[PDB]
Design a protein around this nucleic acid. Sequence first.
DNA 1: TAGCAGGATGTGT
DNA 2: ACACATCCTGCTA
Length: 88
Amino acid sequence: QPIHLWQFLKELLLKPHSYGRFIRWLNKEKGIFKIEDSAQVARLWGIRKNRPAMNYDKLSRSIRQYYKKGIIRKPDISQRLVYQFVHP
DNA sequence: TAGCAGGATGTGT
DNA sequence: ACACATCCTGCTA
């Protein structure tokens, strides 16, 4: 079973030493993160899944599919490149 | 420019 | 079934 996108995102967020210039917690407790380097996050996701055509347009389309699943959501005050984990 | 909401359909297990 | 990936239009900062 391939890694899921939400888990992949949590993985990058776990190690700011390695990935902090690409993606970071804005509010760790509330699960609010910012994508700082969208092209880079998409590039890393494409490598992980072996989709060399992956880009942020398509990565973010998959994040949006999470809205109705209650996995990721946009924060109360919506901001570009800012997202929020619903649970843990 | 670049990101964002969500439909339709292709891909691979 | 499931989780995307890949196309799309229209919308928004």
